[PDB]
Design a binder for this molecule. Structure first.
Ligand SMILES: Nc1ncnc2c1ncn2[C@@H]1O[C@H](COP(=O)(O)OP(=O)(O)O)[C@@H](O)[C@H]1O
Ligand SMILES: Nc1ncnc2c1ncn2[C@@H]1O[C@H](COP(=O)(O)OP(=O)(O)O)[C@@H](O)[C@H]1O
Lengths: 140, 353, 89, 101, 101
């Protein structure tokens, strides 16, 4: 399932470059190894996908991502983002790691507000639906 | 002591005890329309069954099967029939079972042997013709270790049932009068030899509006009796329900709405016994308190459908859902103004070949 | 599937909220599909306001209780070219 | 053993099949006539399998529906006719034999 | 015609094959009452336990004789008309091949 998720995100990347910056051709012209460390349970597995595309884009243009921008989501092969499950444990894990920004599918704006206010202090969220939003909340 | 337990197990069994049926159609009407709304097709079939048994003399067995999305009320209709015909009821799940001995007991020379489940049903139900309800035929444990589902044919085959016998008390029983019924979410997984025997009735889904008329009568009062409240203190207008079903639960079955209304009532119970209101009255403004914020909202994700995406209905394993199909370029297209390579497709999304 | 590709080809969007289904023949004939009643209720939940079925199943869809079918606007079809003219222009 | 021609099934069911099922539903011949024409219509439309099993289901069903019209319903002697039939067993299933023409 | 010549009764094997629902089993039973031999159905479709055709050792706890002894015990004749079913679908597994049996 992660393999199809990977190819989906991959093709979306290949589309995003030509839609965005035609002069680059790094993606369509080069082999690429990509490694996702284990630990995610298969059912939440797709939630990693939104990270994947930004990985490649960082490798693609070569600019570093803005620091400590944790995220999760699920990519649609046409730029929609989709809800993921089990967010509360994810957010506390981001708290332990010193995260100071975060991005979630807008469809999960509900669960994040269930959280106790002390949990939410010091984070800085960006709900999103279409993927292009994230492109401007990382790089520039 | 072993043979004594065996004598007991044998004597309990009816051999000709025949719980009598009512057979007038009128009373069967009244007892069916007051228990389950709609799903009239199964009612009509059972009605024809009643009509034939009354003609050809004696009581009659028959096999039938029900199938459809989970939580449509299948198991619920079973008991309603059980008190309709006046047959005694007995559920018997078999999803994932593999112990053919469980369907047939044990040799009685084994330590701890006891007769298969059916004999327990004969001892308990005391009729020769109860309403056995095999459950989840689709999910029977079908292994290398001897498929019980093959063993089931000895029960359910109209001819081979007539002298069924079980390892505990060897003497054949005569199950012909039993009225078996079978329930499966999808009919195709069912093993082929068995599938041909039983009749295949089809319970359906439910329209969004249809759930409204459902829940106001057969559902809210049920949970109201489960939480121990009386109507005096826990009214729920219809409007709250239509809002619920339209938003908080997108499932063709009613189980999920059943979870919500359960939750609302039990929270109401907490507001009564110690809380503030002496009579909670959920109103649309109040509800989001009790059950929290809405979960689903944006039914049908895309709305403009950007080029190259189209909706497609799909008769999934449970209910039906409006999954989209999507496509996209994977390389710059004009790789060569003269280029002649077939624009090979690459399908994805857990294709079966 | 085919409408996806053709939509992508010319690149124009599909007419809005026009769900469809079928089974294609490699020469533009369409074929009966199974289980229509559940499909239709699911399309009703999604706010669908048009729908397209193989003409061979114009039978089963009409067995449905009248209240389920109110408010839809069906277009039965057999040859595939039909559906093409009921989607894009 | 072979299959069966469309016409052949008529001569089959008219003798060895209808009476048998008629005895299964507990009826007597007095009340449940089925002209030949309805059987040929059945076999022509509602079941395309070389075996007779599917037609066996249809006519069984039709008879038992007749039983329901008898025991409480109106007629003391149901008489199926082709105009009557779609009532009893519903709409035609197959029609466009040979997809292309 | 042949059994009448060479004195005593004689057994023989035969096979039928064709589309399902052609009536195969029905003639089987019809022959059983034609010749006057006893009938006994015996499905073998999809089975893989050769012990079922041969019983068990009798030293195992709960061993019981194979199916055939039961048919012979039941019809009480030495020469019944056994009807093996669904030879095509015999479960041909590693667990002891019935096809050898
Ligand atoms: N039309 C209906 N009339 C009455 N109850 C219904 C109806 N549809 C669904 N239900 C309810 O659905 C619930 C579950 O139904 P049942 O088939 O018994 O179990 P499940 O559907 O969970 O397998 C029951 O509690 C039952 O009251
Ligand atoms: N030519 C025929 N003559 C008599 N009965 C027939 C004929 N063709 C089909 N049948 C009926 O078809 C039914 C099934 O036949 P049989 O071989 O016993 O089962 P199956 O065909 O399912 O293997 C029987 O009930 C039988 O009466």
């Amino acid at each position: 399932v992660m393999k199809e998720s990977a190819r989906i995100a991959y093709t979306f990347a290949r589309a995003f470059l030509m839609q965005h910056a035609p002069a680059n051709d790094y993606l369509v012209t080069s082999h690429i190894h990509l490694h996702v460390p284990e630990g995610a349970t298969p059912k939440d597995g797709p939630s990693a996908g939104c990270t994947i595309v930004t990985a490649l884009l960082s490798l693609a243009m070569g600019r570093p991502v803005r620091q400590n921008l944790a995220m999760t989501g699920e990519v649609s092969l046409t730029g929609k983002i989709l809800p993921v499950g089990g967010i509360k444990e994810k957010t506390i894990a981001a708290k332990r790691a010193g995260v100071t920004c975060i991005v979630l599918p807008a469809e999960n704006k509900k669960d994040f507000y269930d959280l106790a206010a002390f949990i939410t202090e010091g984070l800085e969220v960006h709900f999103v639906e279409h993927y292009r939003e994230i492109f401007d909340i990382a790089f520039p | 002591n072993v043979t004594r337990n065996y004598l007991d197990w044998l004597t309990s069994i009816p051999w000709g005890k025949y719980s009598n049926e009512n057979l007038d159609l009128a009373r069967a009407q009244a007892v069916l329309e007051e228990d389950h709304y709609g799903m009239e097709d199964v009612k009509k079939r059972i009605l024809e069954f009643i009509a034939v048994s009354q003609l050809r003399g004696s009581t009659q067995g028959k096999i039938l099967c029900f199938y459809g999305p989970p939580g449509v009320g299948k198991t619920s209709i079973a008991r309603s029939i059980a008190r309709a015909l006046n047959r005694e009821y007995f559920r018997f799940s078999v999803g994932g079972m593999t112990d053919v001995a469980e369907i047939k007991g044990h040799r009685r020379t084994y330590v701890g042997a006891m007769p298969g489940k059916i004999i327990q049903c004969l001892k308990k139900t005391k009729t020769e013709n109860p309403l056995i309800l095999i459950d989840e035929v689709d999910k029977i444990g079908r292994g290398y270790q001897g498929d019980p589902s093959s063993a089931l044919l000895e029960l359910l085959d109209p001819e081979q049932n007539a002298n069924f016998l079980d390892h505990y008390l060897d003497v054949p029983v005569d199950l012909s009068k039993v009225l078996f019924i079978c329930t499966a979410n999808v009919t195709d997984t069912i093993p082929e030899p068995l599938r041909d025997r039983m009749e295949m009735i089809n319970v359906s889904g439910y329209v969004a509006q249809e759930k409204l008329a459902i829940a106001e009568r057969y559902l809210v009062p049920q949970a109201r009796a489960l939480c121990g409240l009386d109507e005096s203190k826990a009214k729920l207008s219809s409007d709250v329900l239509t809002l619920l079903i339209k938003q908080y639960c997108r499932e063709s079955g009613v189980r999920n709405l059943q979870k919500q209304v359960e939750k609302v009532l039990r929270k109401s119970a907490y507001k009564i016994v110690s809380g503030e209101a002496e009579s909670v009255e959920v109103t649309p403004e109040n509800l989001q308190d009790f059950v929290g914020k809405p979960v689903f909202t944006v039914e049908r994700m895309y709305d403009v459908t950007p080029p190259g995406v189209v909706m497609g209905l799909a008769w999934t394993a449970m209910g039906g859902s409006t999954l989209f199909v999507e496509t996209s370029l994977r390389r710059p297209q004009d790789k060569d103004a003269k280029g002649d390579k077939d624009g090979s497709l690459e399908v994805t999304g857990q294709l079966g070949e």
